[PDB]
Design a protein around this ligand. Structure first.
Ligand SMILES: [Zn+2]
Lengths: 304, 147, 69, 101, 134
């Protein structure tokens, strides 16, 4: 018999490492269907912000307009969503873009020549030769230009190379950054890699003590198999550190003396962020999306 | 075609149905080709077992009453081949259930004693898994090949 | 042409690690493998991204119809 | 209230009234497998499964066959009501362990 | 009610390239001419060589519409034995004078019992339960 309160009794969480970008946490005594659901939402549902409409005024660079526009879209912006409302597609462009729906980023770079002794460095030989993500100047407009006062729009990674130029060439554009989801375009992904790995199980059938224990220990990563003494059997110190290479099974002396399985209930999640939200926030929102999905169907009329 | 006489012809004479047997030798020219043949050898194998949840899923996965696949207006299901300890269905039982829901209820089940491409020696000692046996529309012996 | 923004396979930003990689090979005199490790590229997909990058843009730029000679 | 989301396929619904197929738009395995799992925990549900007619068309079909004293509509309503409570349990335990850290 | 009951001695347990099934070769401890060949799911009910198995054939368990999963307070004939299988009789073979051998199928898992007196009780029925103890 399974109850939602009986699940609360057995369900456990274990945080191994929680960095500013990546969090490694475990979900103990939960079903595959729930663990897989969170991973799917933490890569599809999770949305973000980024350029969408690049308006070019001039581009004398070697990099084609389409390519340069696509590169700006790919550059992640250190912009927290919820600050922006969702844009409506049916009404025209004059009503479509507002101070609540759109963020404007301008790029105005002109390359010139500089006198220096000559292989010679491009930063020495020319001025404004390399166009970086940091060169996308934030332009606040309309009703709210005070809401982004203590929050300036800056790309998450500024040193990203956008274009390379030679004297005479120029880039003049107005990029319209909007709110979108990762399912539409990868340029909206919030997390890098959200994946889980099942806890490896090493079922030792025989004691296999002695020099064979030292041979068995070399088949698994260093911090997995621990030996007490020459006797006292051969135990598993940390089965979590195992890579699951099945190296132990390709030896006649161990092929029948050991079994390699898993703990179906135990999940080892690894979540790295793109930079917009913290890895915890991304997981929390994933659980909140699954709950909201079930809630939306609960308060809904079952037609026909 | 732009008229009903030409429609009727393309639906009853030149269609694609009434063409299971070529008139050259009266042999079949219709059947599954690669993944399905390899899938069948595995699904109808003795080692293939399925839980109530798994079994019913495989049934509705291929038979949808709403698309008019059924002949009984309710998906009929066979009892498990293993009752105790855990209720389990065999792979061959899925093949029996698919026929039980697609063949007419008014007519009796199919009776056929055929053979397989895979010799009994491959399935171990004393197996009869080469002899394809259908008794009252029930796969009781043998796997299903390209044959 | 230039270093791609993000790894084709997973999506880890690689565009900021091209010039830094050449500095680890020139000044630091390290091997290809250790240089990529210091940049924070452990997945072989992210590893090949920079390691296998040609950078034809430097060859392409030498043809400039806007400056004499 | 939007009527396109949930629809009762009368061409498969029992005259009265345990077995019946439901068709949900803009849904797949995500809700599908989770919902049939919860519906199957019901002691009155005889048969339950989910089926996606085709990947290109945004449809999700869920069949609920029960024993007596409960309609398929009630079994679906219980399934949705239990999944909501299940998610509350997950959300409550996660908040507690964040503080416990 | 019951149709057959006897205690058998296992002489062979062969997997035969199967990870979960085994072909059991047995002989009756009471009757001399009685022999058994049965496929069992060794994963659930393991059988070892030189073992005493109480194999029993029953018609039902003491009119049913369909099988239902167990629910609190349900009593069955299966509660007395460890491993229970449901199958059908498909072939009736006669071996020389007085000896008769029956063929059963528990969904691919085949059984071949050889005897003489069971000709009356053992009949080709689309419903025959096989129950094993110890
Ligand atoms: Zn990568």
């Amino acid at each position: 018999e399974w109850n939602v309160e009986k699940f609360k009794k057995d369900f456990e969480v274990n945080i191994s490492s929680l960095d500013a970008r990546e969090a490694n946490f475990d979900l103990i005594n939960i079903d595959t269907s729930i663990a897989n659901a969170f991973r799917r939402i933490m890569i599809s549902e999770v949305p973000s912000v980024a350029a969408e409409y690049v308006y070019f005024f001039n581009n004398t660079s070697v990099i084609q307009d389409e390519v340069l526009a696509h590169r700006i879209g790919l550059v992640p912006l250190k912009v927290d969503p919820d600050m922006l409302t969702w844009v409506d597609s049916n009404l025209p462009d004059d009503e479509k873009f507002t101070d609540e729906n759109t963020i404007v980023l301008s790029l105005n770079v002109k390359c010139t020549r500089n006198p220096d002794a000559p292989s010679t460095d491009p930063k020495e030989l020319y001025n404004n030769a390399h166009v970086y993500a940091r060169d996308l100047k934030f332009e606040p407009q309309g009703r709210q230009s005070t809401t982004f006062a203590d929050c300036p729009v800056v790309p998450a990674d500024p040193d990203i190379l956008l274009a390379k130029l030679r004297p005479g060439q120029e880039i003049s554009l107005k990029a319209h950054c909007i709110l979108g989801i990762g399912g539409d375009h990868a340029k909206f992904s919030p997390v890098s890699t959200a994946s889980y790995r099942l806890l490896p199980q090493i079922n030792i059938l025989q004691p296999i003590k002695g020099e064979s224990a030292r041979r068995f220990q070399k088949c698994f990563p260093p911090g997995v198999i621990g030996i007490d003494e020459g006797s006292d059997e051969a135990y598993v110190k940390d089965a979590r550190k195992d890579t699951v290479s099945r190296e132990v099974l390709r030896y006649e002396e161990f092929a029948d003396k050991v079994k390699l399985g898993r703990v179906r209930n135990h999940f080892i999640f690894n979540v790295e962020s793109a930079g917009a939200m913290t890895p915890e926030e991304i997981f929390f929102k994933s659980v909140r999306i699954l709950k909201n999905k079930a809630e939306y169907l609960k308060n809904c009329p079952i037609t026909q | 075609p732009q008229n009903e006489n030409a429609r009727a012809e393309a639906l009853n004479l030149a269609n694609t149905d009434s063409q299971y047997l070529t008139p050259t030798s009266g042999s079949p020219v219709r059947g599954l080709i690669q993944d399905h043949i390899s899938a069948g050898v595995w699904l109808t194998s003795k080692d293939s077992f399925f839980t109530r949840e798994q079994y019913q899923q495989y049934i509705y996965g291929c038979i949808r009453p709403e698309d008019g696949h059924t002949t009984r207006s309710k998906i009929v299901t066979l009892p498990p081949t293993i009752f105790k300890p855990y209720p389990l269905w065999t792979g061959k039982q899925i093949i029996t259930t698919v026929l039980l829901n697609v063949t007419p209820p008014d007519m009796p089940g199919i009776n056929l004693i055929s053979k397989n491409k895979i010799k009994n020696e491959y399935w171990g000692k004393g197996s009869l898994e080469n002899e394809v046996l259908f008794k009252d529309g029930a796969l009781l012996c043998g796997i299903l090949d390209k044959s | 042409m230039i270093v791609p923004v993000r790894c084709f396979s997973c999506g880890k930003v690689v565009g900021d690690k091209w010039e830094s990689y050449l500095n680890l090979l020139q000044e630091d005199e390290l091997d290809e493998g250790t240089a990529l490790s210091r940049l924070g590229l452990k997945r072989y997909c992210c590893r090949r991204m920079i390691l296998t990058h040609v950078d034809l843009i430097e060859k392409f730029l030498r043809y400039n119809p806007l400056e004499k000679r | 209230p939007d009527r396109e989301k949930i629809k009762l396929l009368t061409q498969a619904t029992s005259e009265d009234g345990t077995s019946a197929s439901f068709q949900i738009v803009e849904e797949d395995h995500t809700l599908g497998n989770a919902l049939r799992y919860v519906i199957m925990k019901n002691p009155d549900v005889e048969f339950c499964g989910y089926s996606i007619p085709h990947p290109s068309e945004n449809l999700l079909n869920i069949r609920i066959q029960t024993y007596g004293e409960t309609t398929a509509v009630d079994a679906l309503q219980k399934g949705l009501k239990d999944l909501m409570d299940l998610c509350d349990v997950v959300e409550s335990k996660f908040t507690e362990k964040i503080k416990s850290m | 009610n019951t149709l057959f009951d006897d205690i058998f001695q296992v002489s062979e347990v062969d997997p035969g390239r199967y990870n979960k099934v085994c072909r059991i070769e047995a002989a009756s401890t009471t009757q001399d001419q009685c022999k058994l060949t049965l496929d069992i799911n060794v994963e659930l009910f393991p059988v070892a060589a030189q073992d005493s198995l109480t194999v029993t054939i029953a018609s039902s368990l003491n009119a049913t519409r369909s099988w239902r999963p167990p629910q609190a307070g349900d009593r069955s004939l299966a509660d007395d034995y460890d491993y229970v299988m449901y199958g059908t009789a498909y072939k009736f073979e006669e071996v020389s004078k007085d000896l008769i051998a029956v063929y059963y199928s528990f969904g691919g898992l085949l059984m071949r019992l050889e005897g003489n007196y069971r000709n009356l009780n053992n009949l080709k029925q689309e419903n025959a339960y096989l129950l094993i103890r110890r």
